[PDB]
Amino acid sequence: LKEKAIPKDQRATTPYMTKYERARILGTRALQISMNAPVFVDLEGETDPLRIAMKELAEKKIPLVIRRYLPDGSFEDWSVEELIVDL
Amino acid sequence: LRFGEMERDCMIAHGAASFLKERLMEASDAFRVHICGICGLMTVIAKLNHNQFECKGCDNKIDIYQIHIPYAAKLLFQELMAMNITPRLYTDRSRDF
Amino acid sequence: VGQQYSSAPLRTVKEVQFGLFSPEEVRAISVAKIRFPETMDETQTRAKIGGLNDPRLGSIDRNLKCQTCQEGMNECPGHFGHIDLAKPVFHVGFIAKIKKVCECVCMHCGKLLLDEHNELMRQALAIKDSKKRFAAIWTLCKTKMVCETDVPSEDDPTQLVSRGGCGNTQPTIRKDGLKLVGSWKKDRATGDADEPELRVLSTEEILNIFKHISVKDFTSLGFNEVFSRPEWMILTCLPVPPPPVRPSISFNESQRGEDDLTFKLADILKANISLETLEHNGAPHHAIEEAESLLQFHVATYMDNDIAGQPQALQKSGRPVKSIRARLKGKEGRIRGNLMGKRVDFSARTVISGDPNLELDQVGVPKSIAKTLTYPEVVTPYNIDRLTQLVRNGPNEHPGAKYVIRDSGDRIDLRYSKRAGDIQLQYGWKVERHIMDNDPVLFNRQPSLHKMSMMAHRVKVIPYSTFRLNLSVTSPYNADFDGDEMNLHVPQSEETRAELSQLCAVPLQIVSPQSNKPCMGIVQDTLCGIRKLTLRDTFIELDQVLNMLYWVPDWDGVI
Amino acid sequence: AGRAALYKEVYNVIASDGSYVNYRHMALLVDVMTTQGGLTSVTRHGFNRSNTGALMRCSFEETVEILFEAGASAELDDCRGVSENVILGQMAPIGTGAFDVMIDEESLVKYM
Amino acid sequence: STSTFQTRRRRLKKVEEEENAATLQLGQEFQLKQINHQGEEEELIALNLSEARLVIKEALVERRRAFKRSQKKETREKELESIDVLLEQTTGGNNKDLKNTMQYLTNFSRFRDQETVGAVIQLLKSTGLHPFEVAQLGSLACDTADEAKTLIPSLNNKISDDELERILKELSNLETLY
Amino acid sequence: MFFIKDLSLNITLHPSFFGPRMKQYLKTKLLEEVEGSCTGKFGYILCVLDYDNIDIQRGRILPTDGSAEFNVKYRAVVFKPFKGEVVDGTVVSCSQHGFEVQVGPMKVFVTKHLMPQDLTFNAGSNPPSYQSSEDVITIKSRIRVKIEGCISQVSSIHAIGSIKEDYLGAI
Amino acid sequence: RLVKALEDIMVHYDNTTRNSLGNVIQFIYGEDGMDAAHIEKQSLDTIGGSDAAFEKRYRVDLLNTDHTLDPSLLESGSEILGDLKLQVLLDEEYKQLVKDRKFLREVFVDGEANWPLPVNIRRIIQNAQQTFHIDHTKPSDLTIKDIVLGVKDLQENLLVLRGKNEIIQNAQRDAVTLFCCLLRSRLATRRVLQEYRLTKQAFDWVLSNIEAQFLRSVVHPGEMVGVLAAQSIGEPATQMTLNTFHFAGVASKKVTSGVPRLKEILNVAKNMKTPSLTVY
DNA sequence: CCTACCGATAAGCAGACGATCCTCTCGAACCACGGACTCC
DNA sequence: GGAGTCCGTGGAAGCTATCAGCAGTGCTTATCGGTAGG
RNA sequence: UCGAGAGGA
Ligand SMILES: [Mg+2]
Ligand SMILES: [Mg+2]
Ligand SMILES: [Zn+2]
Ligand SMILES: [Zn+2]
Ligand SMILES: [Zn+2]
């Protein structure tokens, strides 16, 4: 009730990025680049925003934080840099 | 083309919650309506120029919330309203669970 | 969006509370009076009377009006009115819910038959459920048909102490169509010798008992203090749906073509207006009930015409009327037909064909289909030169655009437009552009039985009107090319496109999690020829071996 | 033991024609029917009469019958389901919709 | 639309509550004991025209310091002209209401120097009265105990007639010059 | 009369403004709408307090669009009046009906009947006046008014005040 | 009916198979918590075979002239002989292998060794011999301590559920069990050298390649699981030829099978059809 | 050894549900009173 | 100087001639042997 | 548009 929120310490979630998180982080970032959002990584002549959203994940210059909700309501804010990309 | 139950069930299976939501709103119904936050009903008289948003039965022009929902849902809640059923669309969480 | 900006906030509907309409709130919510049952002409002149249709609600013939708010056909969502029912009437859906409450809570006082003092009543009320607690309360109060005053003898030593009010005998209730009657016993060597007494239980009597039911008798029977008060199961004031719910349609110019519910609501007004004058003028006692049971029937068949085992209600010509219940009933009826599944835009369908030279994930979209379907691309520095060249090619030279959206909501149909040849194209503008190659799109084969059948397909725009596909991808869909047709859905966002390319891809769905084995393989000529080739018997000479190696797209260049 | 027998009979029908469907799928629906107290019918009255919010259940056969009981008992649909978000036209908490994403100023300045 | 701070719950329609009067029956939003953005249950923050005048002056003096940091990479009538200049730099001409309030707040301020306002708040926010009553005492000039009890009718029983006169005599000595 | 309220505001931000100079831009959009506004729930919003250290938290990047919905937690000064509250302001408007008093950003009107019976209007005087003996209400004349009633009206609160009582009148 | 009953069901962020309402169906999806695509039918060599060949192929004995490892396999084959402290670990290794055989026989009573499990170790060992070109003539770089402990340290790195308490720690050990049984079966100290011929360089890569494949094999929270199951069971029913017949030559005559039997299983359903019980 | 009561198993009898998507074409609605206007 | 066919306006039909369910046991209501306490 | 009928993988 009083904000719940599990801190950045003591977290029971997978340190790896879930395929749904990857697709949401890419889909939204590609949408934002398409909506003229400023690009953080050095562009290599990329005409497609998903080609960029994918390249932004390589250097990890995405400033997004994932609120992963548990079944009891409580959530863990995982920064895209913390989440490892094995998949 | 029809994006029925068979079509929806596959997009659920995949996990693509936005593509299914896109086919179910942007590519189909999609309607913006004003609802009274005090009650949860569509009783708001939305004037988008004079700004007299007043809900007849509540007096409020402040606790009113516009919402993007399918035109079929709007119609369904109005059909339920015609049979004395009140589906109070509540934007505020009150049980946590 | 429903077109136009609003100065009100937009928020996710986190929960939905269900209840009943209070006839007190309907009379305050209402915008219309509905005196005239007529649905057309000012007063037999032109454009709908202030009785039924647009008195102070939903607009009609190209007019904005809508009770001074205007907005227009596509924006005005219609406004609910109110109909004052001459005599209160039951709701078809809550027929046994009223009946069982009558059988549980005793009449003559408005109090429960049983109380906390009974041991089984404590065993029944112990669950804080809703319907499962009421399930035992219905069977418990069903019998012991009589109210009480003094009962405790084995909890208090011997003498009995007061708890309830007037101990009148509760009658037995059953069904005789829309009405329910009670059977009082008595007959102990006095009146009616041995046969019981029967009384007609009218809505006005039932409602007064339901009005005298306590707030703690609601919680005990599964009802709410402000949402589902049992008094609202009987209708005193009826909410009238607006034109978007029951439209006029407009048959040419000087004709009606009204909705089924408009004629059905007029029939309720016709039944109510007779009661309106019969109650006011000389009352013939057993002649008002002969019309009150018809108003009860009209208000009932307007909600349910399916309905009970005995009545029907037909609209002459001989066919029946379409009730609200039948309107939102399952299988292609509001819920399944319009909410749980619906017809969509940006969708194609043609006779499918196989192709040895198509890529596994690829799809052969006909040249016309790509020209008929459009993706909305936002004007960024990465395209512009590309978008301006598409715009210039227009709606007929394949890589073109149909509409261009300005900074504000203004579509520029290039097919028409005086400025189609010009157009500067500013940043942030949208370009509804013809489908291009390697565009992630949804390819679907009905019935969509498993995770597959709906996959992402690399687009290759090809001549000949046919939906071409790879041969090895014939297995996830299960279809062959004996005249089969297939669906398609071009995604309109950069996010839903990535939700396809990085989730529903044909190679991404190569292995079935159903059986843990793959769900695509080498079949037909590709498999029949592989057996004939992979042998010690057959060898390939220099002339054919060089073409064999050249056909491989990822060939190292080393013989 | 009832669910272990239930699975034995559910598996044997798939085993009768075409091998096979992975344990996880049948052990799931078997566990669905038995993690109720006892047995659950997969019909209009078995699984459909459940602890769920009215809008998820109204989509399966008992539609107007359930919509009336929703109002009559003052039920509150939690709006935590696959079906109730489909009706509401909102991104349901399914796969991609089962987590929210925000932007961070601490990170936004950091990258420039 | 804002509609925040003290919210929940709206259990269908509601009766309104009560009229907003000077019987300390303040708004349904302005409770004696309210909440904070940090979380704590902080007492209602009500200020008099002298206290509130030096709070907007504080918020706008510290606004220009921050607004121009990002740009890198006393006396009665002089107070009127210096505030008029400050309002044009920190805020655009469009804000008509703030300019009308600041001209009023300075022309009717009982205490102009921050030194005196500290002792005024220590004299009033101590007595044991509602912060709105304090916000009206330091704002409105009163010589008689019966004058302060009639203009601020929330007192009467709340405070002694003799002890209130001791406070009123202290404010005439704490009073500033214009 | 003046209150310090620690209230918040929900703002939706376009994806193109996701650049290092965003924190300052969101802070501006807040005082662009809030500072100068007049709510019924909170009264006249006068000044957003402490531009430094403003709690913004995080902006939920929305479902099908890339916009971030930020909730800006702030603290500001509010001018909320009440039906009974006594105030002293400047007389601005004056005519046969009565006079308007500018108490801060709010104008309070006093009718000829709401003011004393032993006063009366003087038409033959420029600017318009209200005489009695040596007490005259003109273009300036600071007065003390008791707010008898309050008017919500648009984003501009008004009042229907009285000056006919003991310890009231002109100041 | 299947898809409607299993709509709400999905894997959660705490490895639990719950739904919309929030009730627990399974505490770990399909009891192991592995994404059904990342699995192959692997054979458990500890369950299969006679007790003599199991003692022959796995038992390591440094305190014997014929039951020891030849120094052509291990670099330090002669200085490891007769070691009491190193045979303590080779007793510990074979004592966990003797437990695997008796525990596996309790689970798979029918005998069947070929079971669908993640991480194809069968191919990882095949790939090490090609990626490192290891020869059979020359001995390995590793020793007994490098194998027996590295195999044990790998079991700690095979996480499924993230936990710190008595329940989740035991839920983790219960989640692996069958897989780490295959791991002890495949990475036994004798087998590593007797059949594979593995060097310390290639073995340390094999231990990391097993955990990398295993951590990839964990279910994705958001996988619609119930929806997927409902489709995966409703799909073969569409192509289910044969109704009430089969077997040939067991129990001559009818026995309801296929779609008619399936209706009974879903309806539940106190009707005879074929109620033939079995007595032993 | 009876009767105030309490659970046992039959004889009636009651209401909403059954592949997904797709495409094409045919023919609508009639007995009596009260009295309106245009059209012949 | 009276008709011609017109179409709004009211109009529910009536006495026939014959009926658990692709499932199964659906749920509510009458008859009925026996317990043991006064 | 409604209702009935017809046809297809
Ligand atoms: Mg086929
Ligand atoms: Mg619920
Ligand atoms: Zn309202
Ligand atoms: Zn409208
Ligand atoms: Zn009674």
Side-chain angles (χ1 to χ4, degrees), chain E residues 2 4-5 20-21 29 36-37 45 47 63 70 95 97 104 107 136 146, chain F residues 2-6 8 24 35-36 42 48 74-75 83 86 88 142 167:
Chain E
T2 171
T4 49
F5 177 70
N20 294 8
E29 188 72 29
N36 203 314
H37 278 306
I45 318 102
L47 341 159
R63 182 174 283 201
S70 65
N95 201 332
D97 297 306
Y104 159 86
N107 278 87
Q136 285 279 89
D146 195 26
Chain F
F2 291 71
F3 304 99
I4 293 179
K5 191 73 108 171
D6 35 338
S8 49
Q24 201 199 43
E35 201 189 84
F42 309 93
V48 179
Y74 69 98
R75 195 177 279 267
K83 302 175 198 213
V86 186
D88 53 344
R142 51 186 61 187
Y167 316 113

CSV table of all heavy atoms in Angstrom, one decimal, chain E residues 2 4-5 20-21 29 36-37 45 47 63 70 95 97 104 107 136 146, chain F residues 2-6 8 24 35-36 42 48 74-75 83 86 88 142 167:
chain,number,residue,atom,x,y,z
E,2,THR,N,-4.9,19.9,-12.2
E,2,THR,CA,-4.0,19.5,-11.1
E,2,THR,C,-4.7,18.5,-10.2
E,2,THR,O,-4.4,17.3,-10.3
E,2,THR,CB,-3.3,20.7,-10.4
E,2,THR,OG1,-2.6,20.2,-9.2
E,2,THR,CG2,-4.2,21.9,-10.0
E,4,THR,N,-4.6,17.4,-6.8
E,4,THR,CA,-3.8,16.5,-6.1
E,4,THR,C,-3.6,16.9,-4.6
E,4,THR,O,-4.4,17.6,-4.1
E,4,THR,CB,-2.4,16.4,-6.9
E,4,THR,OG1,-1.9,17.7,-7.2
E,4,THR,CG2,-2.5,15.5,-8.1
E,5,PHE,N,-2.5,16.3,-3.9
E,5,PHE,CA,-2.1,16.5,-2.5
E,5,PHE,C,-3.0,15.6,-1.6
E,5,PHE,O,-2.5,14.5,-1.2
E,5,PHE,CB,-2.0,18.0,-2.1
E,5,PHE,CG,-1.7,18.2,-0.6
E,5,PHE,CD1,-0.5,17.9,-0.1
E,5,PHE,CD2,-2.7,18.6,0.3
E,5,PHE,CE1,-0.2,18.1,1.3
E,5,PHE,CE2,-2.4,18.8,1.6
E,5,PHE,CZ,-1.2,18.5,2.1
E,20,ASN,N,-17.9,26.9,3.3
E,20,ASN,CA,-16.6,27.4,3.8
E,20,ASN,C,-16.8,28.7,4.5
E,20,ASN,O,-17.1,29.7,3.9
E,20,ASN,CB,-15.6,27.5,2.6
E,20,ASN,CG,-15.3,26.2,1.9
E,20,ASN,OD1,-15.8,25.1,2.2
E,20,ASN,ND2,-14.3,26.3,0.9
E,21,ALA,N,-16.8,28.7,5.8
E,21,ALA,CA,-17.0,29.8,6.7
E,21,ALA,C,-15.8,30.2,7.6
E,21,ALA,O,-14.9,29.4,7.6
E,21,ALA,CB,-18.3,29.7,7.5
E,29,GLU,N,-10.3,20.4,1.3
E,29,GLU,CA,-8.9,20.2,1.0
E,29,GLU,C,-7.9,20.9,2.1
E,29,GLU,O,-6.8,20.3,2.2
E,29,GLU,CB,-8.6,20.9,-0.4
E,29,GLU,CG,-7.2,20.6,-1.0
E,29,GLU,CD,-7.0,19.2,-1.5
E,29,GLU,OE1,-7.9,18.5,-2.0
E,29,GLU,OE2,-5.8,18.8,-1.6
E,36,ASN,N,2.3,15.5,3.5
E,36,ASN,CA,3.5,16.2,2.8
E,36,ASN,C,3.9,15.3,1.6
E,36,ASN,O,3.6,14.1,1.6
E,36,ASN,CB,4.6,16.3,3.9
E,36,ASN,CG,5.6,17.4,3.6
E,36,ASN,OD1,6.1,17.5,2.5
E,36,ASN,ND2,6.0,18.1,4.6
E,37,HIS,N,4.7,15.9,0.7
E,37,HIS,CA,5.3,15.2,-0.4
E,37,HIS,C,6.3,14.1,0.1
E,37,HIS,O,6.4,13.0,-0.5
E,37,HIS,CB,6.0,16.1,-1.5
E,37,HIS,CG,5.0,16.7,-2.4
E,37,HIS,ND1,4.1,16.0,-3.2
E,37,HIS,CD2,4.9,18.0,-2.8
E,37,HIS,CE1,3.5,16.9,-3.9
E,37,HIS,NE2,3.9,18.1,-3.7
E,45,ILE,N,-0.3,24.9,6.6
E,45,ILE,CA,0.7,26.0,6.5
E,45,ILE,C,-0.1,27.3,6.0
E,45,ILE,O,-0.3,27.5,4.8
E,45,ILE,CB,1.9,25.7,5.6
E,45,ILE,CG1,2.5,24.3,5.8
E,45,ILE,CG2,3.0,26.7,5.8
E,45,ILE,CD1,2.1,23.2,4.8
E,47,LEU,N,-0.2,31.5,6.2
E,47,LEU,CA,0.6,32.7,6.5
E,47,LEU,C,-0.2,34.0,6.3
E,47,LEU,O,-1.0,34.1,5.5
E,47,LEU,CB,1.9,32.8,5.6
E,47,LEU,CG,2.4,31.5,4.9
E,47,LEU,CD1,3.2,31.8,3.8
E,47,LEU,CD2,3.1,30.6,5.9
E,63,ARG,N,14.9,32.3,-7.5
E,63,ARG,CA,14.6,31.8,-8.8
E,63,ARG,C,15.6,32.4,-9.8
E,63,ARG,O,16.1,31.7,-10.6
E,63,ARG,CB,13.1,32.2,-9.2
E,63,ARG,CG,12.7,31.7,-10.5
E,63,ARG,CD,11.2,32.0,-10.7
E,63,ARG,NE,10.3,31.1,-10.0
E,63,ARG,CZ,9.1,30.9,-10.3
E,63,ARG,NH1,8.5,31.5,-11.3
E,63,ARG,NH2,8.3,30.0,-9.5
E,70,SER,N,22.1,28.7,-14.9
E,70,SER,CA,22.0,27.9,-16.1
E,70,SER,C,22.4,28.7,-17.4
E,70,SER,O,22.9,28.2,-18.3
E,70,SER,CB,20.6,27.4,-16.3
E,70,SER,OG,19.7,28.4,-16.5
E,95,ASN,N,1.6,36.5,-16.6
E,95,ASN,CA,1.1,36.3,-15.2
E,95,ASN,C,0.6,37.6,-14.6
E,95,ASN,O,1.4,38.3,-13.9
E,95,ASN,CB,2.2,35.5,-14.3
E,95,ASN,CG,1.6,34.9,-13.1
E,95,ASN,OD1,0.5,35.3,-12.5
E,95,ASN,ND2,2.2,33.9,-12.6
E,97,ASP,N,-2.1,37.8,-12.3
E,97,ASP,CA,-2.5,37.6,-10.9
E,97,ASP,C,-1.3,37.8,-9.9
E,97,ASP,O,-1.5,38.6,-9.0
E,97,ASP,CB,-3.1,36.2,-10.7
E,97,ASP,CG,-4.5,36.0,-11.4
E,97,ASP,OD1,-5.4,36.9,-11.3
E,97,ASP,OD2,-4.6,35.0,-12.2
E,104,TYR,N,-0.4,44.5,-3.8
E,104,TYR,CA,-1.3,44.6,-2.7
E,104,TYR,C,-0.5,44.1,-1.4
E,104,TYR,O,-0.6,44.8,-0.4
E,104,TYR,CB,-2.5,43.7,-2.9
E,104,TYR,CG,-3.2,43.2,-1.6
E,104,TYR,CD1,-4.2,44.0,-1.0
E,104,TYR,CD2,-3.0,42.0,-1.1
E,104,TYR,CE1,-4.9,43.6,0.1
E,104,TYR,CE2,-3.7,41.5,0.1
E,104,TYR,CZ,-4.6,42.4,0.6
E,104,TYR,OH,-5.3,42.0,1.8
E,107,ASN,N,1.9,47.0,-0.1
E,107,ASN,CA,1.2,48.2,0.4
E,107,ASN,C,0.4,48.0,1.7
E,107,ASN,O,0.2,49.0,2.4
E,107,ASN,CB,0.2,48.8,-0.7
E,107,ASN,CG,0.9,49.6,-1.7
E,107,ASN,OD1,1.4,49.1,-2.7
E,107,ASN,ND2,1.0,50.9,-1.5
E,136,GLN,N,-4.6,35.6,10.1
E,136,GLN,CA,-5.5,36.8,10.1
E,136,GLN,C,-5.1,37.8,11.2
E,136,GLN,O,-5.3,39.0,10.9
E,136,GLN,CB,-7.0,36.4,10.3
E,136,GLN,CG,-7.6,35.8,9.1
E,136,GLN,CD,-8.1,36.9,8.1
E,136,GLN,OE1,-7.3,37.3,7.3
E,136,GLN,NE2,-9.3,37.3,8.3
E,146,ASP,N,-11.9,43.3,21.9
E,146,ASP,CA,-13.2,43.1,21.3
E,146,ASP,C,-13.2,43.3,19.7
E,146,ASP,O,-14.0,42.8,19.1
E,146,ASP,CB,-14.3,44.1,21.9
E,146,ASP,CG,-15.7,43.8,21.6
E,146,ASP,OD1,-16.0,42.6,21.4
E,146,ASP,OD2,-16.6,44.7,21.7
F,2,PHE,N,-3.5,33.3,3.2
F,2,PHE,CA,-2.6,32.7,2.2
F,2,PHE,C,-2.1,31.4,2.8
F,2,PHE,O,-1.8,31.2,4.0
F,2,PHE,CB,-1.3,33.6,2.0
F,2,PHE,CG,-1.6,34.9,1.2
F,2,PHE,CD1,-2.4,35.9,1.8
F,2,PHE,CD2,-1.1,35.1,-0.1
F,2,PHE,CE1,-2.6,37.1,1.1
F,2,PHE,CE2,-1.4,36.3,-0.8
F,2,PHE,CZ,-2.1,37.3,-0.2
F,3,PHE,N,-2.1,30.3,1.9
F,3,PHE,CA,-1.7,29.0,2.3
F,3,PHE,C,-0.5,28.5,1.5
F,3,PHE,O,-0.4,28.8,0.3
F,3,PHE,CB,-2.8,28.0,2.2
F,3,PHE,CG,-4.1,28.4,3.0
F,3,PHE,CD1,-5.2,29.0,2.4
F,3,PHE,CD2,-4.2,28.1,4.4
F,3,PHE,CE1,-6.3,29.3,3.1
F,3,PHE,CE2,-5.3,28.4,5.1
F,3,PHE,CZ,-6.4,29.0,4.4
F,4,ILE,N,0.4,27.7,2.1
F,4,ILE,CA,1.5,27.0,1.3
F,4,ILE,C,1.0,25.6,1.1
F,4,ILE,O,0.8,24.8,2.1
F,4,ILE,CB,2.9,27.1,2.0
F,4,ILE,CG1,3.4,28.6,2.0
F,4,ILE,CG2,3.8,26.2,1.3
F,4,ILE,CD1,4.8,28.8,2.6
F,5,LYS,N,0.7,25.2,-0.1
F,5,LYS,CA,0.2,23.9,-0.4
F,5,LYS,C,1.2,23.1,-1.2
F,5,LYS,O,1.9,23.6,-2.1
F,5,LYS,CB,-1.2,24.0,-1.2
F,5,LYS,CG,-1.9,22.6,-1.4
F,5,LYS,CD,-2.5,22.1,-0.1
F,5,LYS,CE,-4.0,22.2,-0.1
F,5,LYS,NZ,-4.7,21.6,1.1
F,6,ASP,N,1.5,21.9,-0.8
F,6,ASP,CA,2.5,21.0,-1.4
F,6,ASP,C,1.7,20.0,-2.3
F,6,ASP,O,1.7,18.8,-2.0
F,6,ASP,CB,3.5,20.3,-0.4
F,6,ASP,CG,3.0,19.9,1.0
F,6,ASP,OD1,2.0,20.5,1.5
F,6,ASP,OD2,3.7,19.2,1.7
F,8,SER,N,0.8,18.4,-6.5
F,8,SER,CA,1.5,18.0,-7.7
F,8,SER,C,0.7,18.2,-9.0
F,8,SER,O,-0.4,18.8,-9.0
F,8,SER,CB,1.9,16.5,-7.5
F,8,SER,OG,0.8,15.7,-7.1
F,24,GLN,N,14.9,21.2,-16.7
F,24,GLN,CA,14.6,22.6,-16.7
F,24,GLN,C,13.3,22.8,-17.5
F,24,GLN,O,12.5,23.7,-17.1
F,24,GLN,CB,15.7,23.5,-17.1
F,24,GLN,CG,15.7,24.9,-16.7
F,24,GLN,CD,16.5,25.9,-17.5
F,24,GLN,OE1,16.6,25.8,-18.7
F,24,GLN,NE2,17.1,26.8,-16.8
F,35,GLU,N,1.6,28.3,-12.3
F,35,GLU,CA,1.8,29.7,-11.8
F,35,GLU,C,1.0,30.7,-12.6
F,35,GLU,O,1.4,31.0,-13.7
F,35,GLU,CB,3.3,30.0,-11.7
F,35,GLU,CG,3.6,31.1,-10.8
F,35,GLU,CD,5.0,31.6,-10.9
F,35,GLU,OE1,5.3,32.4,-11.8
F,35,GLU,OE2,5.8,31.1,-10.1
F,36,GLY,N,-0.1,31.2,-12.0
F,36,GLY,CA,-1.0,32.1,-12.6
F,36,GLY,C,-2.4,31.6,-12.7
F,36,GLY,O,-3.4,32.4,-12.8
F,42,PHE,N,-8.2,24.6,-4.9
F,42,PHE,CA,-7.1,25.3,-4.2
F,42,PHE,C,-7.0,26.8,-4.2
F,42,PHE,O,-6.2,27.4,-3.5
F,42,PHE,CB,-5.8,24.7,-4.7
F,42,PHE,CG,-5.6,23.2,-4.8
F,42,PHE,CD1,-6.0,22.5,-5.9
F,42,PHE,CD2,-5.1,22.5,-3.7
F,42,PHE,CE1,-5.9,21.1,-6.0
F,42,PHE,CE2,-5.0,21.1,-3.7
F,42,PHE,CZ,-5.4,20.5,-4.9
F,48,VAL,N,5.0,29.4,-7.7
F,48,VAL,CA,5.6,28.1,-7.5
F,48,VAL,C,6.8,28.3,-6.6
F,48,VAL,O,7.8,29.0,-7.0
F,48,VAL,CB,5.8,27.2,-8.7
F,48,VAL,CG1,6.4,25.9,-8.4
F,48,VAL,CG2,4.6,27.1,-9.6
F,74,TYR,N,5.3,19.4,-6.5
F,74,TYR,CA,5.7,20.8,-6.2
F,74,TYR,C,5.1,21.4,-4.9
F,74,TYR,O,4.3,20.8,-4.3
F,74,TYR,CB,5.5,21.7,-7.4
F,74,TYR,CG,4.1,22.0,-7.7
F,74,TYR,CD1,3.5,23.2,-7.3
F,74,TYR,CD2,3.3,21.1,-8.5
F,74,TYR,CE1,2.2,23.5,-7.6
F,74,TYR,CE2,2.0,21.4,-8.8
F,74,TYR,CZ,1.4,22.6,-8.4
F,74,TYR,OH,0.1,22.9,-8.7
F,75,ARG,N,5.6,22.6,-4.6
F,75,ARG,CA,5.1,23.4,-3.4
F,75,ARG,C,4.8,24.8,-3.9
F,75,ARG,O,5.7,25.4,-4.5
F,75,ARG,CB,6.1,23.3,-2.2
F,75,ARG,CG,5.5,23.8,-0.9
F,75,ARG,CD,6.5,23.7,0.2
F,75,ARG,NE,6.6,22.3,0.7
F,75,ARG,CZ,5.9,21.8,1.7
F,75,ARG,NH1,5.0,22.6,2.4
F,75,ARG,NH2,6.1,20.5,2.1
F,83,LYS,N,-16.3,32.3,3.2
F,83,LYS,CA,-17.6,33.1,3.5
F,83,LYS,C,-17.6,33.4,5.0
F,83,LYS,O,-18.2,32.7,5.7
F,83,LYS,CB,-18.8,32.4,3.0
F,83,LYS,CG,-18.9,32.0,1.5
F,83,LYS,CD,-20.1,31.2,1.1
F,83,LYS,CE,-19.9,30.5,-0.2
F,83,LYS,NZ,-21.2,30.4,-1.0
F,86,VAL,N,-12.6,38.2,7.0
F,86,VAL,CA,-12.5,39.7,6.9
F,86,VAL,C,-11.2,40.1,6.3
F,86,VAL,O,-10.1,39.6,6.7
F,86,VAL,CB,-12.8,40.4,8.3
F,86,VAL,CG1,-12.9,42.0,8.1
F,86,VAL,CG2,-14.0,39.9,8.9
F,88,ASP,N,-8.7,43.5,4.1
F,88,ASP,CA,-8.6,44.9,3.8
F,88,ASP,C,-7.8,45.1,2.5
F,88,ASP,O,-6.6,44.7,2.4
F,88,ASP,CB,-7.9,45.7,5.0
F,88,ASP,CG,-6.7,45.1,5.6
F,88,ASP,OD1,-6.3,44.0,5.3
F,88,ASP,OD2,-6.0,45.9,6.3
F,142,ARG,N,-8.4,52.9,0.8
F,142,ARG,CA,-8.3,51.5,1.3
F,142,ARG,C,-9.4,51.3,2.3
F,142,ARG,O,-9.7,52.1,3.2
F,142,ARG,CB,-6.9,51.2,1.9
F,142,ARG,CG,-6.3,52.1,2.9
F,142,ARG,CD,-4.8,51.7,3.3
F,142,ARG,NE,-3.9,51.8,2.1
F,142,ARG,CZ,-2.6,51.3,2.2
F,142,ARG,NH1,-2.1,50.8,3.3
F,142,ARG,NH2,-1.9,51.4,1.1
F,167,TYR,N,-16.3,47.6,13.7
F,167,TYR,CA,-14.8,47.4,13.4
F,167,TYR,C,-14.6,47.2,11.9
F,167,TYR,O,-13.4,46.8,11.5
F,167,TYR,CB,-14.2,46.3,14.3
F,167,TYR,CG,-14.5,46.3,15.7
F,167,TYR,CD1,-15.3,45.3,16.3
F,167,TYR,CD2,-14.1,47.3,16.5
F,167,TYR,CE1,-15.6,45.3,17.7
F,167,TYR,CE2,-14.4,47.4,17.9
F,167,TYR,CZ,-15.2,46.4,18.5
F,167,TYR,OH,-15.5,46.4,19.8
